[PDB]
Design a binder for this molecule. Structure first.
Ligand SMILES: COc1ccc(NC2=C(c3ccccc3)C(=O)N(Cc3ccccc3)C2=O)cc1
Ligand SMILES: CC1=C(/C=C/C(C)=C\C=C\C(C)=C\C(=O)O)C(C)(C)CCC1
Lengths: 214, 242
């Protein structure tokens, strides 16, 4: 039945129901963090899991989820992002604040990629829903069910892709391949100012530069 | 689409390369501090021996990885600085991938290069920390569940290596489209090779996501060294520390 187990229409609705630099961005997240409970309850079968696992899932992925959302909403702006507070944060402003690298990553690996393959909101909602149904989050009563729902989002999302964009044989793939880049950008954002900042020493890749040659 | 002739050859060439790179490396074990069979749970000679053993296999690994990289069409055509970028950051993932392949259910152990099954304790006995070992063995049990095959691990490795978002990559569009080629191939091969199981593909591309996490945990384990007074040998120190 596919889409019947993960109504992409229900998800689309969840996604539509909840709509200095570092501090603006921080409050924006603060604001949007009040919605995740709502956006998650609408997602199919989510509220059906053990109350405790719902919390774990939400606790584990809130930052990837929020990042994805503002990256997409930013499809509109140029070299910037649009906060859930109504503020435009420009690329430079982020550089002057000292968070240029991670900021540029979110533009090229997220905003931009999303702008190209013209990612729609149903698709976004499914990636979000895949990020939500993360079975590896520790503490989970039963990873197995969380995994099962995630797979159900797999099927559904693909069916959807082959239907709305049948002339794009690899749509489903281009979407999933966004998740790795999002996961890295995520684990970065969660880093201690020291690991986060601590600018390295312009490495000299001699041993490897060698090996490729030998 | 179905497996185009162009594809089937690529895959066959790839599985050809692994066997090759894994052959010219099979010689290097005659240059690897043997695993010490000492009773003292934690001496200082034993701790160093075991740590040398693991760090060395890590070295042979980097080389087996650099050889393979040269065998993937398109790799040797990028900036030398890009080839460095893709390998520098990819190394860890390919290692974890090549570990899961050698994962043994029942034994709950990982047998590196032709023999000697290492388990969680051994891993510990070698310097690694529990917060990295567990995730490792977990990713293992899982990849193992997928009952993948030689070609399937190859394609994955290749997809891992051709990640356009690795830091310091310049020709990002080339790397991207280059990756697409193996994704697409892996898709076809999977559909055919694994019919009645359409999820194999998604399940696969997802491990690519698990690798990013295992990557940052491992880098949490490299720093941990700065407080242990154990040193990484030149090669590893270059691809990680920096
Ligand atoms: C697949 O081939 C390999 C077999 C063993 C290794 N060994 C090592 C890993 C490693 C093991 C399993 C998966 C990934 C990496 C690693 O992280 N280090 C560095 C280190 C060692 C002790 C304490 C702190 C860091 C190794 O020497 C590498 C490849
Ligand atoms: C990207 C980014 C960061 C993290 C943001 C997080 C974890 C959530 C943002 C949510 C928003 C911005 C939601 C919205 O507006 O809908 C930090 C602070 C590390 C530094 C600057 C770059």
């Amino acid at each position: 039945s596919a889409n019947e187990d993960m109504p992409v229409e229900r998800i689309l609705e969840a996604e539509l129901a909840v709509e200095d630099p570092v501090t603006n961005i921080c409050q924006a997240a603060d604001k949007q963090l009040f919605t995740l409970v709502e956006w998650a309850k609408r997602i199919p079968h989510f509220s059906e899991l053990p109350l405790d696992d719902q919390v774990i899932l939400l606790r584990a992925g809130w930052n990837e989820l929020l990042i994805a959302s503002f990256s997409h909403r930013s499809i509109a702006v140029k070299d910037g992002i649009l906060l859930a507070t109504g503020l435009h944060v420009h690329r430079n402003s982020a550089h002057s604040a000292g968070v240029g690298a991670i900021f540029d990553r979110v533009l090229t690996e997220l905003v931009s990629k999303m702008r190209d393959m013209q990612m729609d909101k149903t698709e976004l909602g499914c990636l979000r829903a895949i990020v939500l149904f993360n079975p590896d989050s520790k503490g989970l009563s039963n990873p197995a069910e969380v995994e099962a729902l995630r797979e159900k989002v797999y099927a559904s999302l693909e069916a959807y892709c082959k239907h709305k964009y049948p002339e794009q044989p690899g749509r489903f793939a281009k979407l999933l391949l966004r998740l790795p880049a999002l996961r890295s950008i995520g684990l970065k954002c969660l880093e201690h100012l020291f690991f986060f900042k601590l600018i390295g020493d312009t490495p000299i890749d001699t041993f490897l530069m060698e090996m490729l040659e030998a | 689409v179905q497996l185009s002739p162009e594809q089937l050859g690529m895959i066959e060439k790839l599985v050809a390369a692994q066997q090759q790179c894994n052959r010219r490396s099979f010689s290097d074990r005659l240059r690897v501090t043997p695993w010490p069979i000492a009773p003292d749970p934690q001496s200082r000679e034993a701790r160093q021996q075991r740590f040398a053993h693991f760090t060395e296999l890590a070295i042979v690994s980097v080389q087996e990885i650099v050889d393979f990289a040269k065998q993937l069409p398109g790799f040797l055509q990028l900036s030398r600085e890009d080839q460095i970028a893709l390998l520098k950051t990819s190394a860890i993932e390919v290692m974890l991938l090549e570990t899961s392949r050698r994962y043994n259910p029942g034994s709950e152990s990982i047998t590196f290069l032709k023999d000697f099954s290492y388990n969680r304790e051994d891993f510990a006995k070698a310097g690694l920390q529990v917060e990295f070992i567990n995730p490792i063995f977990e990713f293992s049990r899982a990849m193992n569940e997928l009952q993948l095959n030689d070609a399937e691990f190859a394609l994955l490795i290749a997809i891992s290596i051709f990640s356009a978002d690795r830091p310091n990559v310049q020709d990002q569009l080339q790397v991207e489209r280059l990756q697409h080629t193996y994704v697409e191939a892996l898709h076809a091969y999977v559909s055919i090779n694994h019919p009645h199981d359409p999820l194999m593909f998604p399940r696969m591309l997802m491990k690519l996501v698990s690798l990013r996490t295992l990557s940052s945990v491992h880098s949490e384990q490299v720093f941990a060294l700065r407080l242990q007074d154990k040193k990484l040998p030149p090669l590893l120190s270059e691809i990680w520390d920096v």
